[PDB]
Structures are given as structure tokens and as C-alpha cells.
Amino acid sequence: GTGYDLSNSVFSPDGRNFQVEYAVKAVENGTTSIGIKCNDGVVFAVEKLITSKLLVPQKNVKIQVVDRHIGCVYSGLIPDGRHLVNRGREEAASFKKLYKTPIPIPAFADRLGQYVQAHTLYNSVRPFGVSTIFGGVDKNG
Amino acid sequence: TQQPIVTGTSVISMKYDNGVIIAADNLGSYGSLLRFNGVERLIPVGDNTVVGISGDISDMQHIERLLKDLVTENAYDNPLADAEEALEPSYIFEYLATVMYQRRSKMNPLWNAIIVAGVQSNGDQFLRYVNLLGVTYSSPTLATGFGAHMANPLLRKVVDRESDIPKTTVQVAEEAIVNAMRVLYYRDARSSRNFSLAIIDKNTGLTFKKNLQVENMKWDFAKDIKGYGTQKI
Q1: How far is Cα B228 from Cα B29, in angstroms, rounded to an integer?
Q2: Which CATH number is associated with domain B1-233?
């Protein structure tokens, strides 16, 4: 058969979801963003393309903050990255409201992963076109 | 909240030529029981605002959480959140007043009285009051509970009108606040000797004094009071 790449969450005969790989292709076409985990913390860095000098420098911030301790940068479709960051902020707010402590980094990672995986479960929703490097410091370092 | 349980008493505040002063005791009353000592009822928002809350302590902790979340959500996507476009006392008070009036209209009030004090970005003093009914008002001297009956006269003796504010030094205002706190501890039954005080100045910044005590207590004459009328010994 053919046409397995026309709808999301459709398994191809080789056991693949081609819409996810097309979203990955969309990610690869984005600017470069890196993260480095050091001894006492983490660092995030990103490259912003100056298509014209009409862009106001130091504005158009790409690195976003979740809670007061989570840093998130993304490569790909910047609006999808902002959507994912808002979802993560909601998750962190609920976690703090319920369990008092700020959300741990692995917990936040699993929340975002469950969100994206759910977005790769239905043909009525499009996979996220972003790859997200995030992190921070919690009680476990 | 339909009936307050653990409560905190009066919160007082006044203005002076360079900012505001706000004080509140450190006691959580379980009815007639002075149950919880050490309850910080002054919540500093940022480096330029202090909220003094009287009433149900559970609702006060809810307000604390809401203010911390407001600060956090303001920091979102705001590279100047530590400079311009930072949380002002006016913004905090308007958020609180919206919440209080909406809860009042939902018949589930936040059984509290809130005094928001601070200094605006342009050096102007902000000092306003809201309660569980959503009533909002401002004055050179503000006070909740018994303070509104006893502390407000002593504070208006120092600042009666707006023109008196530039004539009031921080020392005079702090002395008036301490005297009002002493009188309150004298005549309030649900009060504490230990309290906290905060001075928000346009030049010095947030000054948070904890573990203050009411001193210079006049009780000697009590040795001469005998009986309730005709008794001589």
C-alpha cells in the first residue's frame, strides 16, 4: 500500500509514523540551539538570524522561562515552542499548587513528553514542529 | 469562607514624606485562644510592595500563593521584570481587589482585610485598603479591625491631611506606628506583644523588621486600684 504519510498517528508497514519524521525535518530547518549541563547547573544558548538590521537587537527573546528555575529553548516552529512552553508552565503551576515544592526537572520533562506523545496519537492533531532543550536545578541537582 | 476560624487582628499603616510604613502583629487566634504565635502577616511582594492581611489565615495563605504566582507569571516573557514593567503596588492592589469583589459576588468571600502599601516607580506613595466585600479606599492612614478605631486616631494626629505627609519624617511615622501598636496591645484582647513592621521608602527600599516587641508599658498604677468601688484594701 501507499499514502501512510498523509495522516498523523498512522503506522506505516515498516513501523514508523512519517508525520513525526516530517515534523523532525521541519525542526532540522530551524536555527541552532544548544544546552550544556555543568557541575552546579545548566546553560542554554541560541542563535537568532538577523534577516535585516531593522530588527531591534536584544529583543525577540527566544529563550523562555518556566516557573523560576526551568529554562527552555527550542529549534523549529517557534510558535509550537511557545505553545509547549505554555503547557509546561500550566503543568508546573498545578504541580506547585498541589505539592507545594517547585516541580522537579524530570517531572517537567515527563509532563512535556506525555503532552507531545498525546499530540502524536490522533489524526486530528498535528505533531509538534519543535525540538526542545530544557532543564534547570532541583533538589537532586 | 463562610465563617473565619484561625484569624489575625489589626493591620495598621501610614504615609510619610518619602514612602509608607505598615505594621501587623504575629498572632493567629483560634476564637478566644491565642493559638499560633509567630504568624508573619506582612507579605512583601517584590522589593517595592507590602501586603498586610487581617482575618482568616487560610485565606491569607491563599493570597500569599496568589501573589507569588502573580510575580512568577509577570516574570514570564518579560526581560524587564526586574526593572520596567515590574509589579507595582497599584497592579497588586487592583488584582487583589478584583479577586475580593469577585469572591464577594460569588457568595464565597475571602474573609480578610488587606492593606497594600508601597512606592510607585515615580516615587509616589501607594496605600490602599480592600476587604471581603470588595470595598476599596485609600487615606494617609489606614487600619483594619480595632486599629481602625484606635490606631487611626493616633495616626491622624500625625498626618491629618495630605499636606501633612511631606512634613512627616520616617522617624516620626515609625514612632507613631509603634505607639499605635502599643495602644492596641493595651486594649485588644486578641493581640500579641510581638509584631512585624515594614518601611517602604523611595530612597532606601524595602525595610523589613521582624520580631519587634511592645515596650515602655505603663502598669505601675495598677497596684493602687483596689476593689470595684467601696473596697479600700
Answers
A1: 30
A2: 3.60.20.10
